[PDB]
Amino acid sequence: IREILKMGDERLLRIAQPVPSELLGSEELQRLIDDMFETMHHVGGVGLAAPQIGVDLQLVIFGPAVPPTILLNPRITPLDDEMEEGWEGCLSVPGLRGAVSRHRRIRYQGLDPQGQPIDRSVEGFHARVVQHECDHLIGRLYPSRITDFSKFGFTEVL
Ligand code: NI
C-alpha cells in the first residue's frame, strides 16, 4: 500500500516517461503493477496512474463494468466531437467531486505489460476512466479540465 500523492505535489504535474522496452515482461514491472493493484484496492479507486504513487512512468491500471487493464505508453484518439459531462473524483483530491466534460468515444492504444499491443474503441464511462487516467501521465488533474464551476464542490455538500 504505497502512499497516494495529494494535489499540490510537483510529482503529479510532471509529464511521465515511457516504460522502456527493457522493463516489458520483467519482475521489476510486475512488482510495480502489484503495488498499484494493492494500493488501488486499499482505497477503493476504479483507476490509478503510476505518478499518483510517485512513479514517473506511462502506466495506468483500471477496471457500469470496465475490464481489469494494465495499460502502458498510451495514446488516445477521439473518434468524434461528441462530449459528455459526468462526475469525477480523484484519490489525489480527497473530499471533492467535479463535473468534467470528456470525449464520449475514444480509441485507446498502448502496450500490455508483456509488450503486446492494446487497441480498443470504447464509449461512456470506459472512455471517461481512460481519459482521466491518461491525463495523470501529462500532469493533469480534473480541476484543470472543469469548465462549469457550479458543479465543483465538497462530496459531503453536493
Ligand atoms: Ni485520478
Side-chain angles (χ1 to χ4, degrees):
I1 305 157
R2 303 220 228 165
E3 256 279 302
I4 303 192
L5 298 185
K6 286 167 43 161
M7 189 171 74
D9 198 291
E10 153 264 298
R11 288 172 291 168
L12 300 174
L13 300 168
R14 297 337 218 72
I15 303 310
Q17 298 313 312
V19 183
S21 67
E22 184 170 54
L23 284 200
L24 295 178
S26 75
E27 245 315 291
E28 312 86 286
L29 183 54
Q30 180 53 52
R31 294 188 211 290
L32 210 211
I33 302 304
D34 293 318
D35 288 340
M36 297 170 61
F37 268 107
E38 180 85 3
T39 306
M40 179 174 92
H41 291 315
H42 184 78
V43 308
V46 301
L48 193 73
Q52 294 182 266
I53 63 169
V55 180
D56 178 18
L57 290 174
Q58 292 174 24
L59 199 220
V60 293
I61 66 163
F62 52 88
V66 174
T69 304
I70 302 139
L71 172 60
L72 330 208
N73 301 343
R75 189 187 88 176
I76 295 176
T77 317
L79 257 18
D80 62 32
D81 305 296
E82 195 174 334
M83 303 290 295
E84 188 178 289
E85 280 216 319
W87 289 114
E88 301 195 10
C90 186
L91 304 163
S92 307
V93 189
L96 299 153
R97 294 283 177 275
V100 179
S101 134
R102 315 255 189 199
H103 285 281
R104 185 165 171 186
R105 279 183 201 92
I106 67 156
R107 188 173 180 205
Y108 69 96
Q109 295 167 96
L111 296 185
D112 69 23
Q114 283 123 282
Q116 265 303 278
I118 295 170
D119 186 358
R120 302 178 172 168
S121 298
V122 293
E123 82 195 16
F125 182 68
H126 187 157
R128 174 174 297 285
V129 173
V130 167
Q131 282 172 90
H132 178 101
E133 294 299 332
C134 297
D135 263 353
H136 283 298
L137 306 184
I138 64 170
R140 288 285 226 121
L141 301 193
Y142 75 89
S144 68
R145 295 274 187 204
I146 294 178
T147 48
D148 186 343
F149 285 87
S150 76
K151 280 159 163 152
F152 187 32
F154 290 89
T155 307
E156 76 194 356
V157 179
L158 286 173

